[model samples]
Target chain A: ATRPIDGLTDEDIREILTRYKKIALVGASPKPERDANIVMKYLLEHGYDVYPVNPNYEEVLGRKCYPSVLDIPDKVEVVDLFVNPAKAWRFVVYAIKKGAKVVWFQYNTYYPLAARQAGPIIVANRCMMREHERLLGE
Target chain B: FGQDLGKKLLEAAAAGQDDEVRILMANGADVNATDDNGLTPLHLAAANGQLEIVEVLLKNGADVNASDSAGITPLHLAAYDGHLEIVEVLLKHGADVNAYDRAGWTPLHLAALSGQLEIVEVLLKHGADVNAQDALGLTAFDISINQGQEDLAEILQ
Candidate 1:
């Protein structure tokens, strides 16, 4: 019983943005063209706790890099994914095991089966920053 | 009936059309075909509560333990969704009862947290660890309680 994103009302998205404060960003990159980088920066600018998890780099956007979700010390409420669908499953699983309440997949990064299995609220095939801009215009 | 049959098979399975799935596999559809999300047809079938499609896919040599990008197998979806019959079929086919996702969640954790009583019982009987902990150091019992599944938590205790 997966609900379509279109079924998610503005209030739902707004509630999510407000309630889930901490985010663990997997596949975050330093490249300006990458959505991961832009979203991470946006979340940071918006005053959310964003931890960048990228094994390739020691840091991203001035924050210390975590090699994996398991390495983050703080409780992450949301685990946002920017990796390919194949690679995204592992992080979603890790996020569930880590007690994260939500898992988000960027547009075109959806794995419906994995999203359904994850115990957290899933926002897949959607961009968090894009949603925030659309629903909660600042 | 060609290389793209994999994608078609997934579509058929998602639609709950066992006949179409069968025809596609007969036409040489890869039983383990995955979408961009790394979800096999079996994964789609299981998650959608299509039992017949699941059996057909499994019979067609679909990897019983096929996992999506998050290391989530069909069994994980079945348990999380509270599909007892699907869970039974998967276990009978050697599905790992204690498979862990990247988040350290097992089928037991899902069943318990979701308050699926029968699924939890079946998983335990199939050798699921009652005290298994997720990456956050929370056990199935803890999740059951956290989710306010008092009966489930009591049973786990």
Candidate 2:
């Protein structure tokens, strides 16, 4: 079932985070200062199978990085899009195709039609690291 | 190790200065010498798509599989950046198709992840490990799936 992006509660966020194990992070960066990098590190430390996607580097935070979601060999439960809004829809399409159960748009990232799709739950305009910290009490 | 010559070689290779790279090589620069970050001239050339510079460095006896502090190699950089020609050149000159970084990510893993299908094909044709796993136990094919490059993943499958 698709929940309204603006209507998700802490319970919804918790269920989403706990229910999904493997996360595909699109637009992952090599630079340590970048939020994607930091978040990837945090996700890994927290025991989430985080796959960082970027074309610029061979690895990120000691994890093997993929270039795109379509390239990952494993089944990705959640796709955490770190790219801008303009690039979000294409990835949403990809997420739907890959059979991801959830499509998460990072802070300041979203696409209207993506949330209306029939497959995965869509969470938008929210910071995953922040929510994880608050809801999971980490 | 001649630090001055190594620095010059890395800069010239990265800048695509084939002539300067040749001059530095002729001056007895250590072909395998690494800088502070363990990046050799070959790493720089391959990363920047400097085909001629890479050839010069390789001919001068640079380790085709030399890795940096993070275990990143020339082939890894070329594959990640989608330099098909450079990757072919490297493979022709004895670069390891399955070279892994500190994270155990082979060049195939990088190519698969970044949707560099052509590079991935070249590496696989040259005998890259299709079932190779990284530190996290993800294979090159797995990376393609996670990256959403289904076409590349299909080829791998």
Best by TM-score: 1
Docking class of 1: incorrect
lDDT of 1 by residue, A1-138 (tens): 233433456687788899988999998889887789889988998889999998779999999899999899999999988864434655666887899988887764554346446557777667888888887766
Q: Against the native chain B, what TM-score does each candidate's chain B reach? A: 0.95, 0.94
lDDT of each: 0.80, 0.78
lDDT of 1 by residue, B1-157 (tens): 4547887887678768878877877777888777765788888777777999898878878898988666888998888767899999999999999998767889998787557899998998999988788888988999888767798888787
Q: Candidate 2: where are CA atoms >4 Å away?
A: A1-138
Q: Candidate 1: misplaced stretches above 4 Å?
A: A1-138, B1-3
The stretch of ten residues in a row with the least summed lDDT in candidate 1 chain A is: A1-10
